Design a protein around this ligand. Structure first.
Ligand SMILES: [Mg+2]
Ligand SMILES: [Mg+2]
Ligand SMILES: [Mg+2]
Ligand SMILES: [Mg+2]
Ligand SMILES: [Mg+2]
Ligand SMILES: [Mg+2]
Ligand SMILES: [Mg+2]
Ligand SMILES: [Mg+2]
Ligand SMILES: [Mg+2]
Ligand SMILES: [Mg+2]
Ligand SMILES: [Mg+2]
Ligand SMILES: [Mg+2]
Ligand SMILES: [Mg+2]
Ligand SMILES: [Mg+2]
Ligand SMILES: [Mg+2]
Ligand SMILES: [Mg+2]
Ligand SMILES: [Mg+2]
Ligand SMILES: [Mg+2]
Ligand SMILES: [Mg+2]
Ligand SMILES: [Mg+2]
Ligand SMILES: [Mg+2]
Ligand SMILES: [Mg+2]
Ligand SMILES: [Mg+2]
Ligand SMILES: [Mg+2]
Ligand SMILES: [Zn+2]
Lengths: 209, 123, 176, 38
RNA sequence: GUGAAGAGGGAAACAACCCAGACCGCCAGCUAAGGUCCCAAAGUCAUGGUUAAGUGGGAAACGAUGUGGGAAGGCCCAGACAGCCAGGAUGUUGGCUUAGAAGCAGCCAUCAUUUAAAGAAAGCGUAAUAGCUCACUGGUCGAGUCGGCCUGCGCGGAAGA
RNA sequence: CGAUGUCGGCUCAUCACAUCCUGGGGCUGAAGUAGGUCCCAAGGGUAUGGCUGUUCGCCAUUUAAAGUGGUACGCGAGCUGGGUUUAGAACGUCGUGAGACAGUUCGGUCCCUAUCUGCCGUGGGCGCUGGAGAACUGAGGGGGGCUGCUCCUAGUACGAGA
RNA sequence: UGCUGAAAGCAUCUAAGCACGAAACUUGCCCCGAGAUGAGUUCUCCCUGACCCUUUAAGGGUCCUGAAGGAACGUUGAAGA
């Protein structure tokens, strides 16, 4: 089944009739507008491309605008594809709303995780610190050994080292769908999803059970 | 949130007064026990003519902690100290015959029903 | 070879058909088709099939005997057909057929349902007896072994699914 | 299954058989007699 | 003997092994060891065989109906080998022992009868019997079958960062 | 020998498989539960403490388990500096003595701003054949891969019973 | 672990044929990913003047042109050395 594109609003909670507090991420899902249908004959695969949102004219380049004009829809903040299943079919300029999830029990949510900048091995890879005292010299959060000796005489690819952490694509799987409401452009899912308030989210029905 | 070396008061008439946790049971590298969890203890002080003695090695269930317990609406119940109830090493059933101070409904197990019945108060 | 050199009489009622190595044998009790190994040359004259090796193949005679043996029981198949009987031993062990599915109660939580392949049909004359019938001797054997395997006879009370014929030796437990 | 370098018939119901390049002893009488060269 | 104090070709690389001793020049020719399907110069050469393991391209005692060659031998149309039918008996539960010991815990003996043949019993079985089966023999089948010898090539035995 | 820093720990690891646990299977002198032994299997997982410089080991208590080995007995231009080769001092022992011990004892300086390889991240350039903006396909690469207990089945199969 | 089955009248999981079989393998899940120079595909956007010279060729230069886009500057960010 296709998914949809949305915006992370923030977290809050739903209280239930019998005392449970459900923590929910609030996801804003406005109509997704279909901007190109891809098929086997023309593209080698089946998919819809969608936009959502709105975009500043003066910020819409001409290439971008011709592509939107072709589909018969107004500009949106970006473009995303969702693969089609056999029997799945859509048409250019079609609107897809959040009611798509009305009876989907769980969804996977993809976002761009918050950025933590250049991170040391303690935070990035949960390395353990060496001694704070007992004579340790200048080596508390530093990484330790990064290899063996003459054999192999090199450091291995993949070695866990410090570097950029976050600001990457992350998918969190099988979150409960707590509420769908198209009149308010809302989807509530149970739990935390990746990203900062404001940033784009891809929501798809869960690939697992 | 009890670990090795932690000291606990004792919420029964077993005669123990102060016990130390020498193992958090229930899994490899398991760090903490909380309300409802079983620990291994050594007895550091006991009264003169009770059911157990200083230096005895046994089990106990934790029934009050400072870290507390979370309830499903987000609430917290915290206690001013850590206490446990002594348990037979093998049967893991209570040594004492009376229970002191409040306990929590997290104990409602087949196993700890006797502790909640005896407790003055149940939170 | 002693087996290969022994002709297969094809009786009145059976229709043999050959197209290179692809043999087909039709009778009143179904039709089987087999592709004989290249190294085998088969001939069909009178009311008989005869077999022989083929110039250039190092193992022609061994192959021809297999081919012979097989075609012989293809003919038994579409005439008399084959019958494999099993029986259940153990309390609560029972079986029944509905259509082409054999329902096996064998001391498991879920009962067991075994789909019969094309050509094989089953009947229980008894809650504890399975009669398979078929024209393909390999398939009927494969099935009988599939069923037996849900609960192979065990050595302490002989309990399980067994071939009706089968000999199950039991043994005593380890003394205390 | 006994697995060893030297496999033999241990009784008259033992049979030596080669299966897939591997010498084996199969017995119809005594399961302990069953061997694989290895 | 070679290196040392020796280049050149071969042994992937590799002083010391194989071939061979560089005065200089050549965009001629023959050979040595070693090679000739492509990397890579020269046989996808000819002829007769072997191997089926990628053996070749690591490793022993020992194990095995792998397969090729050779010389002998035993049994067999007076019916062999395999399979299938049937028999496998009497003294007698041999003597001793033992609670029991009957072919089959153990010890000693192992004769004789009726036999087509059938051990005072080859293995399972029973508390001891019973019961299963082998040796052996008649029948059926109908032409081969058995396993030692000299030898070629293979197979397992064969686990390391 | 115009210097290749030694034991142990800490940090970080990587490989083998002669497999500790989990998985599959043959035999069992395997009734069940639980074991023994061998075969297949390297995917992941594989304890904290008391004593001692210890590695190891004994001990306490856990765990499904607390694996065996290679990696300069992995890892000091990464840390420690308790053991152990300096200079102080003492005891026992040896020596007439200076002194000695591979006996013990108290004390006792651990440098290096990374050029190249390598590795973790992140940019600039050019290319992809006029140039440009997006959305993709998915060759290839990496990550992940653990497991306890309880309940139902069922107090059933099995068992004289437990 | 088996089915059918000769070689070897029988037997035999195997020689031909056939059914199963594990946390290993290939997929399935997540991330990177066309510098995948074998540099791929789809949609959209932009550019429509002359001249001279030599060794005349995918030649060199001049005048006029200067798009789409990119970047620059500025206000900046749960993005960042
Ligand atoms: Mg995108
Ligand atoms: Mg940030
Ligand atoms: Mg630490
Ligand atoms: Mg310092
Ligand atoms: Mg410091
Ligand atoms: Mg170093
Ligand atoms: Mg190297
Ligand atoms: Mg196999
Ligand atoms: Mg010299
Ligand atoms: Mg050379
Ligand atoms: Mg000369
Ligand atoms: Mg050539
Ligand atoms: Mg090799
Ligand atoms: Mg005969
Ligand atoms: Mg030097
Ligand atoms: Mg192994
Ligand atoms: Mg052994
Ligand atoms: Mg491992
Ligand atoms: Mg254990
Ligand atoms: Mg070392
Ligand atoms: Mg240093
Ligand atoms: Mg010393
Ligand atoms: Mg592909
Ligand atoms: Mg990309
Ligand atoms: Zn045997």
């Amino acid at each position: 089944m296709i998914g949809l594109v949305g915006k992370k609003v923030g977290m809050t909670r739903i209280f239930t009739e019998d005392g449970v507090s459900i923590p929910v991420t609030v996801i804003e899902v406005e109509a997704n507008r279909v901007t190109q249908v891809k098929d086997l004959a023309n593209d080698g695969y089946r998919a819809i491309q969608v936009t959502t949102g709105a975009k500043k004219a003066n910020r819409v380049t001409k290439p971008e605008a011709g592509h939107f004009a072709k589909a018969g829809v107004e500009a949106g903040r970006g473009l995303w594809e969702f693969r089609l299943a056999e029997g799945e079919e859509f048409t250019v300029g079609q609107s897809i709303s959040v009611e798509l999830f009305a009876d989907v029990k769980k969804v996977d949510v993809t976002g761009t995780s918050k950025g933590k900048g250049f991170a040391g091995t303690v935070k990035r890879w949960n390395f353990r610190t060496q001694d704070a005292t007992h004579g340790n010299s200048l080596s508390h959060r530093v990484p330790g050994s990064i290899g063996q000796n003459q054999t192999p005489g090199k450091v291995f690819k993949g070695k866990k080292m410090a570097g950029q952490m976050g600001n990457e694509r992350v998918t969190v799987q099988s979150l409960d769908v707590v509420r769908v409401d198209a009149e308010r452009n809302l989807l509530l899912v149970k739990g935390a999803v990746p990203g900062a308030t404001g940033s784009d989210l891809i929501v798809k029905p869960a690939v697992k059970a | 949130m009890i670990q090795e070396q932690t000291m606990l008061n004792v919420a029964d008439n077993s005669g123990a007064r102060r016990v130390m946790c020498i193992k958090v049971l229930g899994g490899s590298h398991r760090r903490y026990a909380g309300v409802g969890d079983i620990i291994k203890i050594t007895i550091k002080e006991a009264i003169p003519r009770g059911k157990v003695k200083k230096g005895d090695v046994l089990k106990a269930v934790v029934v009050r902690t400072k870290k507390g317990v979370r309830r499903p609406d987000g609430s917290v119940i915290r206690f001013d100290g850590n206490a446990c109830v002594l348990l037979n090493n093998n049967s893991e059933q209570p040594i004492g015959t009376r229970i002191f101070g409040p306990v929590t409904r997290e104990l409602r197990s087949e196993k700890f029903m006797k502790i909640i019945s005896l407790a003055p108060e149940v939170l | 070879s002693r087996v290969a050199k022994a002709p297969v009489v094809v009786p009145a009622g059976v229709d043999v058909k050959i197209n290179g190595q692809v043999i087909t044998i039709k009778g009143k009790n179904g039709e089987l088709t087999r592709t004989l190994n290249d190294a085998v040359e088969v001939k069909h004259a009178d009311n008989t099939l005869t077999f022989g090796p083929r110039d250039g193949y190092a193992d022609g005679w061994a192959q021809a005997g297999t081919a012979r043996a097989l075609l012989n029981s293809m003919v038994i198949g579409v005439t008399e057909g084959f019958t494999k009987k099993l029986q259940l031993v153990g309390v609560g062990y029972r079986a029944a057929v509905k259509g082409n599915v054999i329902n096996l109660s064998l001391g498991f939580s879920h009962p067991v349902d075994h789909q019969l392949p094309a050509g094989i049909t089953a009947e229980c004359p008894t809650q504890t007896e399975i009669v398979l019938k078929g024209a393909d001797k390999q398939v009927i054997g494969q099935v009988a072994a599939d069923l037996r395997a849900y609960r192979r006879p065990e050595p302490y009370k002989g309990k399980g699914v067994r071939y009706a014929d089968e000999v199950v030796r039991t043994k005593e437990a380890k003394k205390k | 299954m006994k697995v060893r370098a030297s496999v033999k018939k241990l009784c008259r119901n033992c049979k030596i058989v080669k299966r897939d390049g591997v010498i084996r002893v199969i017995c119809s009488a005594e399961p302990k007699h069953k061997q694989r060269q290895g």
